[PDB]
Amino acid sequence: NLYQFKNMIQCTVPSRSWADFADYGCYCGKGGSGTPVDDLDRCCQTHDNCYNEAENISGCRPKFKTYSYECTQGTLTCKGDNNACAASVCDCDRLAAICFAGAPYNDANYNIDLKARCN
């Protein structure tokens, strides 16, 4: 769920607040359209697409599904006690949190005008 994804980011990127990623480029947070503006935006685009895929599973709601995961000593793991929905969503989240950690953050791309720039 979003609370858990929140916590995954705090684990892999303890250097910046989670709100930094909540409204960035065309794909991070609300939007899902247009040309991804940079590497970080591409992380989010893959993440958004991943959620759309997981939504194909009966009764699977990525923002609300509670999965089983761990974050300790620099390692993020999705656990074995996840069903197919939970396992897919956990994996989407984990791969994005990993993506975020390796991607440059450009202040210019924060809170951009989606209507004008993400067509």
């Binding site: 609370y3 929140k6 980011i9 989670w18 947070g29 923002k63 994005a96």
Partner: peptide, 7 residues
């Protein structure tokens, strides 16, 4: 949760 949207 308790927020808007990060994903």
């Amino acid at each position: 949760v308790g927020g808007v949207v990060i994903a």
